Write a structure and sequence with these properties.
The complex is a heterotetramer, with 1 copy of chain A, 2 copies of chain B and 1 copy of chain C. By secondary structure, chain A is mainly β. Chain A is built from 1 helix and 5 strands. In chain C, a hairpin with a 2-residue loop joins strand 2 and strand 3. Chain C starts with a strand and ends in a 14-residue tail after the last helix. The structure holds 1,2-dioleoyl-SN-glycero-3-phosphocholine (8 copies), the ligand CCCCCCCC/C=C\CCCCCCCC(=O)OC[C@H](COP(=O)(O)OC[C@H](N)C(=O)O)OC(=O)CCCCCCC/C=C\CCCCCCCC (3 copies) and phosphoaminophosphonic acid-guanylate ester. Chains B, D: Belongs to the apolipoprotein A1/A4/E family.
């Protein structure tokens, strides 16, 4: 029920997976706590060891189990 | 029986070893103390002399290091200026190249790509005809290939059944006395295995 | 380039997230941060020396997790943050002490007693009582308030100094003096 | 022995395979005839299609190559010239930078090496005395340890006498009947196994 997202500052944060809020919302508290904005940041999924590009508009519901890594562009 | 006596000799050795290690650790420590005490006394002078001398050592090095850094920063300014002013010209002149040579690149690219358009378009279109011919042949030949493969497969299945049944039954029929004779030998040989190890 | 690992432990409600975030981006929270495992890394100048501080703010409502036990070992200094208006926290301080003693496999570990919310009118734990407890443990007591930002940085600075104190002492204790070396460790 | 019966079925298998090696392979060849004919319908057009396309392709490519080569000539030359002047400026910069810094580095080396000549020299000398004192300590305890070790070696040899003599004889006294009993078990095993493996 908890997923740990990797931050571009070489760290991670454990958040709770909910069947309502989206990636943008869930990652908001994570980025806002590091002084980052969802404009130049991109989240990558964990599928087959490799990362996959994901959108902020997408919900966090199907993110139960895997972990994500946020990068800056 | 053998292990009992052999291991007895082992314990009769461990005891002696313990009786040896006793004075040994003491004698070793006695000698170690003499060494370590000397090492301590030596280290007293060592560390003290090293620290007492490390002061003027660091002072001497830092003194020169100050000059090193000061002169470095002193020269870094004009050097950075040379780099900056020089790069300003180098970059500016290059920018003045990337513009016309860039436009020329784009213009050449235009002809490059446009000539490719007028070539690739008919090339791919004519290739479609070629591929059509290929596919046509592949389809016609394929239809025959599949028909022949089906025929060859049926022929194979015919000989396959003639072996999956007659030959297999021969093998299985032989496997009966064979396995039985093997069981006879295995079961009998098992007697020796147990009567020789117990 | 010296990085130190600081672990902030305490009961749920003391405001560990607030304390840490106040030092990082200097922003006071207003919501109930459901902190579970979140680290904060910043670089500051402590006593003339530049030091990188990686503060680990974990959940204060865990029973007994192996993951927690493991990450607690990686912490050098520990901050015992309790509320001066919460008697339970003052008594639970011993729980933190014992927990740290076990995870670190040592009784002599640099720790600092932090009394947060000292600005609040409600006070059940007196300064002397808390200080006396800290003195008994051989650690300092710092009265803090995340709301007024008083003693916040001071508490962290003290912890870093305790870590330095322990490491310096061990380095100048007695290497050539032959004080506990062994072979199988 | 009965392998002849089994192999006989293998011969029949060969015959069955030969039945396929005939019409099936012949049919495969007939299919190959279709394949070759198909290729003579595909490659015939394909090769000509290639030729009729490679000519204008290499021509169009030549045009592009010309554009590229000419374009590059009108780029590499001026760029090399500008880069040369820029490199000469950089060289002059490097010269005017590495010269004062070089002289400085030489004096830095002087201030460092000469310092070392007056830092490492007494250091090695001090270390020589320190090492000498340490060597004496190592020799004092070492010479003692040599005697101690020799004594312990003597004790060890003495404690080995009770192993290399009575214990060895005991082992021999055990090995004799053991080898005999093992021989009995081995001899029987040999005969027993040979009887069932005949
Ligand atoms: C092969 C070279 C070619 C030969 C040509 C000669 C010229 C060489 C001269 C100059 C080259 C300059 C290269 C600069 C290197 C960059 C290092 C660096 O900044 O890279 C970046 C990585 C990033 O990762 P991150 O987690 O920080 O970013 C995660 C964050 N994201 C998600 C947010 C963005 O950083 C890291 O990899 C961490 C730091 C890098 C650590 C490297 C360790 C290498 C291992 C051993 C060194 C061996 C010494 C041997 C001495 C022997 C003596 C006898
Ligand atoms: C020679 C004849 C061969 C012909 C056959 C062709 C097949 C071989 C070619 C391609 C195979 C493709 C496989 C790539 C799939 C990797 C999936 C993956 O991501 O799986 C995970 C592992 C573990 O990493 P991780 O999960 O922590 O990181 C990821 C970080 N996350 C998880 C946080 C996001 O990923 C990894 O191991 C990443 C890989 C890095 C390992 C480098 C090892 C190099 C040593 C020896 C190889 C020698 C090559 C010789 C050259 C000769 C050429 C002729
Ligand atoms: C002729 C002109 C034709 C026209 C075509 C274009 C030209 C050819 C160009 C390029 C060819 C390279 C092919 C691509 C290679 C992939 C490399 C790679 O990145 O791979 C990694 C992937 C898996 O990672 P992922 O990011 O997709 O998945 C993560 C999932 N997501 C997406 C959610 C993030 O790997 C996989 O999918 C599994 C792949 C495992 C590799 C198997 C190859 C084995 C090779 C040889 C076997 C030896 C046979 C014996 C030889 C004897 C001959 C007589
Ligand atoms: C004749 C020809 C010669 C040319 C003439 C001379 C003039 C040219 C002059 C200068 C060249 C630029 C290089 C200097 C760049 C330094 C950037 C840097 O370090 O500044 C320092 C800042 C400060 O640190 P802070 O306050 O953020 O951290 C505080 C820590 N916190 C996390 C804990 C709280 O750091 C930052 O701003 C963050 C660092 C990110 C910026 C990296 C930029 C690196 C430089 C160039 C990029 C090159 C890429 C190479 C491409 C090749 C591909 C093949
Ligand atoms: C182009 C070359 C010329 C051919 C010449 C010889 C044959 C001429 C004679 C008779 C024609 C018979 C050919 C028909 C073969 C059908 C192949 C085929 O369509 O198969 C598909 C099946 C389906 O299963 P699936 O994997 O899709 O489903 C897996 C299930 N799941 C989905 C849940 C994933 O696959 C299977 O039955 C898997 C088993 C594959 C068996 C291969 C045996 C082929 C026999 C002879 C070839 C000679 C080899 C000699 C080596 C000498 C080296 C020196
Ligand atoms: C346009 C862009 C222009 C920008 C201009 C900028 C110029 C950059 C030029 C030079 C940079 C030199 C770099 C010096 C490297 C040491 C840095 C240093 O002081 O870092 C501190 C670390 C301290 O410990 P820590 O942080 O690991 O531990 C703590 C671990 N924590 C944090 C996880 C808890 O010290 C270490 O890592 C000590 C290990 C040192 C090993 C360095 C490896 C260097 C690799 C390659 C050198 C190239 C050789 C090529 C041959 C050239 C021939 C001409
Ligand atoms: C093939 C190529 C040839 C070259 C080979 C290498 C050359 C030899 C030289 C150097 C290699 C040394 C190996 C050590 C490597 C590092 C291992 C490691 O990562 O170390 C760190 C761990 C840390 O502890 P932690 O984080 O788990 O605990 C913390 C948890 N707590 C406090 C919370 C409860 O340290 C531990 O685990 C502590 C135990 C590890 C220390 C082992 C040293 C033993 C020394 C002497 C024994 C000699 C016996 C001689 C008799 C002969 C028998 C044949
Ligand atoms: C197989 C044949 C080999 C032949 C080679 C013979 C020569 C080797 C002999 C001596 C050189 C070794 C020196 C370095 C010793 C360190 C070994 C080491 O790293 O071991 C790892 C253990 C790990 O366990 P832990 O307790 O740290 O972890 C538990 C942590 N818990 C308590 C904190 C929370 O560490 C420990 O046991 C604690 C470290 C012990 C402290 C030693 C201090 C040494 C200082 C000076 C040497 C003095 C020489 C005398 C003066 C002469 C001057 C010329
Ligand atoms: C005569 C003819 C002879 C023919 C011979 C043919 C030989 C063909 C040989 C090989 C075919 C290549 C086959 C490539 C298969 C690739 C498999 C692969 O990418 O696996 C990914 C996983 C990653 O798991 P994670 O849990 O980390 O990721 C999330 C999870 N997958 C998800 O979807 O939610 O990795 C793991 O399982 C974890 C282990 C990581 C350690 C290993 C990491 C390395 C992984 C893959 C590298 C493959 C190397 C291949 C090189 C072979 C040469 C010897
Ligand atoms: C590999 C060597 C390692 C030795 C390195 C030695 C020096 C090291 C020190 C410093 C240098 C640093 C060197 C760093 C090398 C690689 C660094 C690296 O891993 O960067 C990250 C990126 C992408 O990250 P992401 O997180 O976005 O993607 C997920 C990731 N792949 C995963 O599996 O989790 O991956 C990529 O590089 C993108 C690949 C895109 C594929 C296209 C690739 C395009 C390839 C070729 C194009 C040639 C065309 C030329 C055209 C002609 C010119 C006119
Ligand atoms: C009771 C005891 C139970 C205990 C059992 C314990 C288990 C023992 C297990 C294994 C023992 C074997 C241990 C073997 C150890 C290895 C010995 C070894 O190094 O052998 C080497 C030889 C090599 O022969 P090659 O000489 O011809 O030369 C090498 C090669 N050609 C070259 O050009 O370089 O290879 C040969 O042995 C071939 C010789 C063939 C001659 C015989 C030919 C066979 C002749 C006749 C068969 C009998 C006839 C039956 C007919 C009756 C029918 C009804
Ligand atoms: N007056 C006052 N309120 C505080 C203080 N610290 C936190 N709070 C308030 O307490 C609430 C929760 O704070 P938070 O830092 O999220 O608490 P936490 O105990 O670390 N959370 P968790 O138990 O989930 O890990 C917020 O509404 C916050 O404003 C403090 O020092 N003083």
């Amino acid at each position: 029920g908890t997923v740990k997202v990797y931050l571009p500052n070489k760290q991670r944060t454990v958040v709770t997976v909910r069947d309502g809020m989206s990636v943008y919302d869930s990652l908001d508290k994570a980025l806002k706590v590091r002084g980052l904005n969802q404009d130049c940041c991109v989240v990558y999924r964990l599928i087959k060891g490799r990362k996959t590009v994901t959108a902020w508009d997408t919900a966090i519901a199907p993110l139960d189990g895997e972990e994500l890594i946020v990068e800056v562009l | 029986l053998k292990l009992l006596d052999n291991w007895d000799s082992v314990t009769s050795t461990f005891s002696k070893l313990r009786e040896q290690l006793g004075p040994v650790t003491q004698e070793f420590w006695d000698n170690l103390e003499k060494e370590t005490e000397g090492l301590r006394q030596e280290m007293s002078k060592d560390l003290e002399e090293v620290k007492a001398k490390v002061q003027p050592y660091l002072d001497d090095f830092q003194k020169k290091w100050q000059e090193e850094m000061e002169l470095y920063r002193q020269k870094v300014e004009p050097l950075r200026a040379e780099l900056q002013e020089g790069a300003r010209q180098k970059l500016h002149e290059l920018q003045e190249k990337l513009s016309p040579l860039g436009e020329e690149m784009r213009d050449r690219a235009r002809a490059h790509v446009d000539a490719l358009r007028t070539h690739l378009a008919p090339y791919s279109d004519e290739l479609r005809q070629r591929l059509a011919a290929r596919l046509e042949a592949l389809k016609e030949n394929g239809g025959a290939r599949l028909a022949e493969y089906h025929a060859k497969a049926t022929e194979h299945l015919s000989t396959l059944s003639e072996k999956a049944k007659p030959a297999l039954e021969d093998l299985r029929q032989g496997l009966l006395p064979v396995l039985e004779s093997f069981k006879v030998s295995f079961l009998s040989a098992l007697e020796e295995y147990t009567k020789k190890l117990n | 380039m010296t990085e130190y690992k600081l672990v902030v432990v305490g009961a749920g409600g003391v405001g560990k997230s607030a304390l840490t975030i106040q030092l990082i981006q200097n922003h006071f929270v207003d919501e109930y941060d459901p902190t579970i495992e979140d680290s904060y890394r910043k670089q500051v100048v402590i006593d003339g020396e530049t030091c990188l501080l990686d503060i680990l703010d974990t959940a204060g409502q865990e029973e007994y997790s192996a993951m927690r036990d493991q990450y607690m070992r990686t912490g050098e200094g520990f901050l015992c943050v309790f509320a001066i208006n919460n008697t339970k926290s003052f008594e639970d301080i011993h729980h933190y002490r014992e927990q740290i003693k076990r995870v670190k496999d040592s009784e002599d570990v640099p720790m600092v007693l932090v009394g947060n919310k000292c600005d609040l009118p409600s006070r059940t734990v007196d300064t002397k009582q808390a200080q006396d407890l800290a003195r008994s443990y051989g650690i300092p007591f710092i009265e803090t308030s995340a709301k007024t930002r008083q003693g916040v940085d001071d508490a962290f600075y003290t912890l870093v100094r305790e870590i330095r104190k322990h490491k310096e002492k061990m380095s100048k204790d007695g290497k050539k003096k032959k004080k506990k070396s062994k072979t199988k460790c």
